[PDB]
């Protein structure tokens, strides 16, 4: 239940990178929502 | 659906009045005994003048059972009272008169049982 030994810098950088990157993928979605919200026919955002 | 600790009635006048089922015979399943099988019933209490007394392990048949009962035609008979009939392992009962209906299919194995019923159905 209790960890044996601290992880390296190596591994941790790997996972933090996966975290942030997991944030990377979820921008270009918001950028599509932006580039579509620039005035255009649509039924959303009253 | 007779576990090995059920109280059955009896369907005859052999002398028993109810009787615990012990560990059915034949089908190696024994976690479930249904119509047409045999069980090792130890008498529970009996009419007190009978040659089947308090706690005499004996072998008997199941003739009525509250669980459903499939058929071929697609009907399902289900009584309300789990019942047995004390048996010998070479045929006939040892109670002469039989109470209540039975199932006709057990005829093809228990002919003498069925002949003595008042309702073969």
């Amino acid at each position: 239940a209790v960890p044996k030994k601290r992880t390296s810098i190596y591994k941790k950088r790997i996972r933090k990178n996966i975290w942030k990157k997991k944030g990377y993928w979820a921008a270009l979605k918001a950028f599509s929502l932006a580039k579509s919200l620039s005035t255009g026919n649509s039924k959303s955002f009253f | 659906m007779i576990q090995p600790q059920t109280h059955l009635n009896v369907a005859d006048n052999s002398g028993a009045r109810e009787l615990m089922c012990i560990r059915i015979i034949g089908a190696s399943n024994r976690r479930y005994a249904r119509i047409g099988d045999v069980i090792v019933a130890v008498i529970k209490e009996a009419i007190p003048n009978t040659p089947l007394e308090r706690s005499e392990v004996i072998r008997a048949v199941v003739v009525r059972t509250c669980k459903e009962l499939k058929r071929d035609n697609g009907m399902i008979i289900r009584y309300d009272d789990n019942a047995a009939v004390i048996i010998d392992q070479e045929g006939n009962p040892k109670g002469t008169r039989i109470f209540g209906a039975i199932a006709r299919e057990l005829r093809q194995k228990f002919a003498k049982i069925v002949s003595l019923a008042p309702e073969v159905l």
Partner: protein, 116 residues
């Protein structure tokens, strides 16, 4: 497993989920717009459509149905005494789910209901 079950249920227990749908539809039929999280939008969609059609047939019995569902008393009388003109021959599909930006604080998807 869900398989087959199609009762949209919200984050809430049974009783409170009922109450949320009744209050929330009341306030729709009151204002015409509304802002609820998307899930509540769907769950509304069903019931408010039921009330509309329940007003499309203004007999007493039905009027007492609706009188029993909706909280606010007079929104009902206004409603069934008003709509079989509005929704004459619209024939089902009464709402509209024009959606909108999420909710700062949860980033909870948030939508915005109409009646049309």
């Amino acid at each position: 497993m869900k398989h087959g079950r199609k009762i949209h249920r919200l984050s809430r227990p049974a009783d409170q989920r009922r109450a949320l749908l009744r209050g929330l539809t009341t306030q729709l039929l009151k204002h015409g717009r509304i802002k609820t999280t998307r899930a509540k939008a769907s769950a509304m969609r069903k019931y408010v459509d039921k009330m509309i059609t329940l007003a499309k047939e203004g007999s007493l019995h039905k009027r007492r149905q609706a009188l029993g569902f909706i909280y606010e008393k007079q929104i009902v009388h206004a409603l069934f005494a008003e709509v079989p003109e509005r929704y004459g021959d619209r024939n089902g599909g009464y709402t509209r789910i024009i959606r909108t930006l999420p909710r700062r604080g949860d980033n909870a998807p948030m939508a915005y209901i109409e009646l049309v």
